[PDB]
Design a protein around this ligand. Structure first.
Ligand SMILES: CC(=O)SCCNC(=O)CCNC(=O)[C@H](O)C(C)(C)COP(=O)(O)OP(=O)(O)OC[C@H]1O[C@@H](n2cnc3c(N)ncnc32)[C@H](O)[C@@H]1OP(=O)(O)O
Ligand SMILES: CC(=O)SCCNC(=O)CCNC(=O)[C@H](O)C(C)(C)COP(=O)(O)OP(=O)(O)OC[C@H]1O[C@@H](n2cnc3c(N)ncnc32)[C@H](O)[C@@H]1OP(=O)(O)O
Lengths: 723, 304, 733
């Protein structure tokens, strides 16, 4: 064997091993290892970012699928948002065509999600996210190298690996389009891609046959194999809400075909022509077609009999009465009534339903559901049933066949696609665990190991579901239990970006530069990295680069206030307290919002093991003159042996000082709370204390005594702690 | 009538005059002047390069048609070539998807003409040609200003107007794709566009797939709609590939039904069934490579 | 000839354009002829930028005359830009910082070094312009569907692209500036800002090494910009920025305007700063730190190394090097980064101290011990001129600025507001807006600048930058002073004031919150966002409509000839309409004839404190309640009322406020109502409301708090859909 032949055989063998690896267990390829190698050429290439990301990301999803757990994520609308969610500890990212459509580009006007952008649009968007993540990693790693080993164990390191599943829409055409689209994603480092079974540019939901969907997925796999990337292929079906399909060729779809009177097309065009002839020149859609006189005649007769032509006359008269304005609304009225009339008269149903009306009943249903049209007719004729059924008659003007959309059809499609996809996804509008279960159980009955994905529409009104707040909280976890491992709020980033811009623009016109002050305060409270934005974007690493580039000759040297009461102050007071009662435990103070973006704060005291020894859930409120009141809703000194030592009194002293409080309201106090506030009145922290037992305590602050205790010598304070 | 309503009625009237002008004699629109004005918004825009080029270019073609004469041209592969052919006195330029496919870009590997590039690819190519021509004109005019009256009469001045007819392939999808494609051409100054009646991503002799005529017409109408919104009297070229085609992706349109081929011996099984059965036999006899039959779920009766 | 006539015509047209009031007091270094020569023959028209520039400039001039100003920020997305315009902000800023931070498909995000291709910021701006133009088309489509009355009720937003974008330093010479300006104009941007820095010279994390260019180079950038704009027939707004307030270096001493600010050494027996620096580095290298080989960049003579070596020895710097290198070995030959910095700082101090670093004016002022006559002469005098005057006066102090040069060759200058003024004044005849770059927000510094400029150019419009990173709470200003700061800028003639990368910051906080919220509270995180959007009636509530779905459907209908197939409510909050219906009964009984509208929005943006307002037909607020709902630990809800008004005296004691309370209690499922710092009227009100049975119990700590417990039976009774009990309440039966 020549060197040429040996090199070939070697790569084919390597490729064959790759094919046969467990990664692709239960996956069918419609091509050989040889067919992949002959595409690769001679000059080595290596898409390492996508390759490594795909490996780790797939293993991680498999891990979560076996533990019945899941990642719950959203689509970031900026590179900053993508980096942020990884800091907050979300493991993976979604990127959707909706947000890409809404954002536009330098040459693409923003607009609806019609997937009418160039196929390069979503990959171009993804490229920014990958570069953001890779850069975040380089900036993090630079800083961490400067840190000591004890600083590295203290500070947390975030995972900025590009675990992305991006929107490949319908594939943007045939196999050359799909392969090109996949190639563009891989080249920018994306390891996951989702392809749906719609007809392009029809977004009235038109599906394609299953053989076309499968070829998209197979084409994707082929491209990924050429590039040596074990990419995660997500097969989506839109069949749950679909009504149309652009072909009847595939046997798997034929069970769901609806069939019937003149053709639906003829009757529609005749109806439109009538509007035109009665003088609405706007509706000239009939000029698109060259329908024969015989068909117009037949169709005309039917519209007359059923009184549709009657409704047209009425409609056109209403149009003139109003004074010849937009016919949009009036035409819709008539079309709806027409559609109903045609469907009703035609006897619109599946072939299975037609023969069922004419072997047991349930035996037949099961046979019809898995049978081609030719197969189902053969079986029926053998059984002496031969009902009249024509699906050509129910075709739309475009030529699309009508199908019975629903979860049963979504299952049928997803099952056919399962051997060519790593993750299956039923598109849904409504968030509903029962619908998700129906899908998940059907798939897992035949493919127990098939990982799933669930979409969460930002537009779906959650407060109309009738779910409790606690049910809403648990919804993501319930999805995870049913094997939905990757669940995403599609264009969440778009939405939160909008609300933020509205608020700040309003805030700036309302409170001028105080709008910025308040943002800065918020960032300090949560200790956001955006507090120091120069560091965030990677200034430290950039300076290092300038030093290297210049050989430290580049000139960087020249010639010629506390904003809030610090947590450290309380930590020092607790050091005195810990000392006197002789606890070995270094006490940490934490003050964050109780939940994200809440005005309700939680102060917590933490031990060395980060166990919460005490807390206060409170919220500051101003009256109309700006006077501040601390509203306490909960309080704990959790350890019984830490109680009645004035731990909570020290916390109150800090809170009152930090927030310049004139009073403290305790809402729905306990007994302990009545005892506490009464004694705090005796120590002189409060002047007056009123208590409606079980409802409210109102405690007025003694400013002289606060000032006394806060004296920097800590004489008064020392006495308080020890007495 | 409020100022708002007057401004609307005015533009509708202007648009209606434009529709009814001789330019669009014998042309059918499946939409009203109102439907165009609704799209235009409030803030003025003006695609003047494409608008003026379209006017002159169309008038010139009409002139040549009446004289039974014609422009004979080729596709320039560089901005230099496009400027050169205008110097040599060729009046108009063609720009095709074949050359665009062969050239590639910074992110598109060069390859066969499958129209698998992003729909922005050919407009991006055309933009270079338009900028080349406009720049050639600016350079020519600068030099000619330095020249005396006698020198001007001596040396010839070349016509660098962007008379281009560019390849819009199949439209790259439905109406949103066509309108987007046309918009991108207009924005870079192209006055002419050609759309063919093939199914996208279907290109391979044989295996040429057409679409129904209603779908082709909607592409052309969608193109016209976009051009009307942008106030550009753009030259729409309707191409048919039906001379060498063998396949069509639908039998719905009546205009195509006369040309449908069918089997007259009805005791023969379907071409599909016979093909898949043949492939399955290869598989069963042990050629594991030919597993194309696994794409379909054909019944035992059909296989038999 | 026709050729000559066409030329003369356009030159005349161009000349009129030049001479128009728009360019009053503006100097061009070129003729109308020189512009027309560039234009060619084939017409072009950058109408979006042309029209935007006109309106935007006229509007700024208007605001300048009124001593008012636009206060804006930089949007980080097209959505943010469209949003600001809805909220009624007139103009947009676009900065290089945010562009750097965002990156692109081929540009890694990073610091603001202006190291991206010059196409980067225009490419970003193009998205904003397309967003605005599309928003306008979508708005106008919907407004055409509306009736005249609907059109007068719903508001129309102004989505014109009034943008001032960052052109950095110009990204090179005149060809770069013209190319940069061209790219902005082509995408529809009417305003551009150019700074007087040297390109690719910016440092992060240092308070040193900001390098200016001479004023002649800055002016040529501005002139080049104007030339390009004139060719394109766009009256674009040129903003001339100076970084001279915080600068320390300049890359040339050629321009006479900068020479007054040059620093120089007065002790001439000191060796050059360069020589001493390289000698110090070479010592580290020779003592064995191979890392520090920066000296190999230069070919410095042995004589210079010797001289410099002597000085470093005398001053004990070579001493510090030995110590440092020993510490380096002791640690065990690790990063020298930290140790070298220590030594360099001490070295710089030592050199500055010994060299006696001052301006030539300050040097001659020392020899003259009139004083103030000289300072004024020095400040407006070239180096050659200042030396001549001094020698005539018999002063000839030793002064060398070459000696203070950096290794790169940059001269040292006295940065400050005086230098910023000097530069801005030179640039004023070539720019429409002047801008002094500032770190600190300070009205006194702004005033110093504004007064100096207006002393010589009373009509010169200004711009003020507001750094997002500047800690506002360290200024010691009151909240009310912070509120008024933008208005105070406007009074001093700063017409366009911007929070540079505000969008970047708010984008970050939002992502952090939602990511945290999603992990905390699952899908309730989305529920809460949706609630917020419904309360303020945000367009994001219906996102399909926002992006322009209605107009898209219309397009599909036109494209298809209406042949395209298009054929195949639970209440989340107690509606405002319910109260409006109750107020219709109330308005009826007392025979008021005013149709009363109910409004419930946050009192300020993104606040938990709400304001319910009752509005008349004239949109006058007849009554209001400023309140905030609060939950206890079990989720029980309390309405906390901080203020309430039935403003009209003749509308009081008719139970208007009682109807509002009934609605609020029902809307928010309130168990109690707390009134904080109540008035007398409030004590009288709540006491009587207890008698009508709305409240079971009412406790009042006079002047401090009222706590009113809700009578649930009586609320249920009043809310009965027949409105029998409610009718009796309104009529006092
Ligand atoms: C806050 C609400 O809206 S209701 C939620 C209330 N939370 C709970 O009931 C949880 C369990 N209970 C607790 O943890 C306690 O109530 C807490 C929160 C007050 C913490 O208790 P401590 O940390 O001991 O409070 P602290 O010591 O500062 O109390 C101040 C004074 O009250 C006294 N005190 C506290 N608890 C009691 C008690 N049960 N009986 C008598 N006196 C008491 C303290 O001894 C001290 O006075 P003294 O030292 O001069 O005698
Ligand atoms: C909320 C705070 O902490 S700040 C205090 C609130 N605001 C103010 O003080 C501003 C000035 N005050 C006012 O605008 C009004 O008087 C308000 C808002 C307090 C009350 O608004 P009204 O529309 O008068 O309240 P409403 O008519 O519902 O009053 C309810 C009952 O109290 C009675 N009432 C209200 N004010 C008075 C009064 N000054 N004297 C006697 N009775 C009164 C009413 O007559 C009615 O009982 P009735 O119908 O049986 O006679």
């Amino acid at each position: 064997h020549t060197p040429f032949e040996q090199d070939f055989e070697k790569d084919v063998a390597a490729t064959q091993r790759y094919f046969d690896s467990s990664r692709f267990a239960g996956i069918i390829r419609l091509y050989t290892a040889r067919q992949v190698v002959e595409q690769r050429g001679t000059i080595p290439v290596d898409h390492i970012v996508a390759r490594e990301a795909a490996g780790a990301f797939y293993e991680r999803l498999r891990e979560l699928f076996a533990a019945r757990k899941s990642i719950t994520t959203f689509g970031p609308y900026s590179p900053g948002q993508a980096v942020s969610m990884k800091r907050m500890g979300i493991e993976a990212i979604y990127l959707g065509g909706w947000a890409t459509s809404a954002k536009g580009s330098s040459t693409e006007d923003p607009g609806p999600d019609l997937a009418s952008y160039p196929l390069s649009q979503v990959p171009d968007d993804a490229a920014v996210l990958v570069r953001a993540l890779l850069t975040a990693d380089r900036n993090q790693h630079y800083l961490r190298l400067q840190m000591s080993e004890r600083q590295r164990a203290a500070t947390p390191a975030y995972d900025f690996r590009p675990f992305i599943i991006a929107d490949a829409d319908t594939g943007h055409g045939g196999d050359p389009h799909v392969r090109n689209l996949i190639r563009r994603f891989v080249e920018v480092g994306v390891p996951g891609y989702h392809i749906e079974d719609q007809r392009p540019g029809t977004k009235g939901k038109v599906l394609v046959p299953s053989d076309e969907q499968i070829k998209r997925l197979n084409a994707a796999r082929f491209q990924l194999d050429i590039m040596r990337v074990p990419g995660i292929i997500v097969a989506r079906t839109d069949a749950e809400a679909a009504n149309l399909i652009d072909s009847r060729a595939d046997e798997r779809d034929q069970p769901f075909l609806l069939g019937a009177v003149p053709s639906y097309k003829s009757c529609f065009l005749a109806m439109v022509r009538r509007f035109y002839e009665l003088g609405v020149k706007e509706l000239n859609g009939h000029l698109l077609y060259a329908l024969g006189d015989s068909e117009y005649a037949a169709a005309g007769g039917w519209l007359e009999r059923q009184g549709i032509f009657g409704l047209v006359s009425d409609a056109v008269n209403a149009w003139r009465e109003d004074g010849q304005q937009s016919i949009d609304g009036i035409f819709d009225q008539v079309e709806s009534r027409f559609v109903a009339a045609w469907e009703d008269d035609a006897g619109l149903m599946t072939y299975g339903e037609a023969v069922a009306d004419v072997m047991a009943p349930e035996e037949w249903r099961a046979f019809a559901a898995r049978a081609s049209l030719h197969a189902a007719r053969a079986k029926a004729k053998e059984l002496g049933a031969d009902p009249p059924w024509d699906c050509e008659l129910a075709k739309t003007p475009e030529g699309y066949y009508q199908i019975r959309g629903g979860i049963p059809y979504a299952i049928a499609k997803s099952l056919a696609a399962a051997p060519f996809a790593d993750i299956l996804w039923m598109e849904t509008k409504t968030a509903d665990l029962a619908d998700a279960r129906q899908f998940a159980e059907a798939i897992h009955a035949e493919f127990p190991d098939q990982m799933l994905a669930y979409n969460l529409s930002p537009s779906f009104n959650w407060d109309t579901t009738g779910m409790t707040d606690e049910e809403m909280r648990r919804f993501p976890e319930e999805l995870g239990k049913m094997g939905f491992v990757f669940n995403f709020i599609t264009y969440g980033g778009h939405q939160i970006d909008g609300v933020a811009a509205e608020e700040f623009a309003t805030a700036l016109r309302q409170d001028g530069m105080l709008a910025l002050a308040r943002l800065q305060r918020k960032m300090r409270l949560v200790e956001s990295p955006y507090r120091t934005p120069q560091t965030l974007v990677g200034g430290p690493r950039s300076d290092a680069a300038l030093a290297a580039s210049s050989g430290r000759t580049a000139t960087t040297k020249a010639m010629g206030v506390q904003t809030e009461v610090p947590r450290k102050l309380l930590e020092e007071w607790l050091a005195m307290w810990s000392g006197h009662y002789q606890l070995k435990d270094k006490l940490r103070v934490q003050l964050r919002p109780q939940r994200a973006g809440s005005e309700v704060l939680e102060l917590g005291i933490h031990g060395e093991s980060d166990d919460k020894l005490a807390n206060v859930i409170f919220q500051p409120i101003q009256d109309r003159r700006g006077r501040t009141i601390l509203l306490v809703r909960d309080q704990n000194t959790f350890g019984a042996e830490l109680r009645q030592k004035r731990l909570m009194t020290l916390i109150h002293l800090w809170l009152v000082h930090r927030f310049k409080a004139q009073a403290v309201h305790y809402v729905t106090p306990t007994d302990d709370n009545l005892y506490q506030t009464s004694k705090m009145k005796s120590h002189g922290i409060f002047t007056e204390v009123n208590q409606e037992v079980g409802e409210i305590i109102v405690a007025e602050v003694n400013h002289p005594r606060i000032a006394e205790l806060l004296t920097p010598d800590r004489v008064a304070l020392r006495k308080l702690i020890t007495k | 009538h409020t100022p708002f309503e007057q401004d609307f009625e005015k533009d509708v009237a202007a648009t209606q005059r434009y529709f009814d002008s001789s330019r669009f004699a014998g042309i059918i629109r499946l939409y009203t002047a109102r439907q165009v004005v609704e799209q235009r918004g409030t803030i003025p825009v003006d695609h003047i390069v494409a608008r003026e080029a379209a006017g002159a270019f169309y008038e010139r073609l009409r002139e040549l048609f009446a004289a039974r004469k014609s422009i004979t041209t080729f596709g320039p592969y560089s901005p230099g070539q496009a400027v050169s052919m205008k110097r040599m006195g060729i009046e108009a330029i063609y720009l095709g998807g074949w050359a665009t496919s062969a050239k590639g870009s910074s992110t598109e590997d060069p390859g066969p003409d499958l129209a698998s590039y992003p729909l922005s690819q050919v407009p991006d190519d055309a933009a270079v040609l338009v900028r080349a021509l406009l720049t050639a004109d600016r350079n020519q005019h600068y030099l000619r200003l330095q020249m005396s009256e006698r020198q001007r009469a001596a040396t010839p001045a070349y016509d660098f107007r962007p008379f281009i007819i560019a390849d819009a392939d199949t439209g790259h999808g439905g109406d949103p794709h066509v309108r987007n494609l046309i918009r991108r051409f207009v924005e870079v100054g192209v006055p002419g566009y050609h759309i063919e009646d093939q199914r996208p991503g279907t290109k391979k002799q044989g295996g040429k797939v057409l679409v129904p005529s209603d779908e082709q017409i909607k592409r052309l109408n969608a193109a016209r709609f976009q051009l009307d919104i942008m106030r550009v009297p753009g030259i729409i070229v309707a191409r048919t590939d039906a001379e060498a085609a063998n396949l069509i992706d639908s039998r719905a349109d009546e205009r195509d039904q006369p040309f449908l081929l069918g089997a007259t011996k009805l005791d023969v099984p379907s071409y599909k069934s016979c093909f898949l059965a043949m492939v399955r036999r290869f598989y069963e006899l042990g050629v594991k490579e030919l597993n194309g039959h696994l794409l379909y779920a054909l019944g035992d009766s059909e296989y038999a």
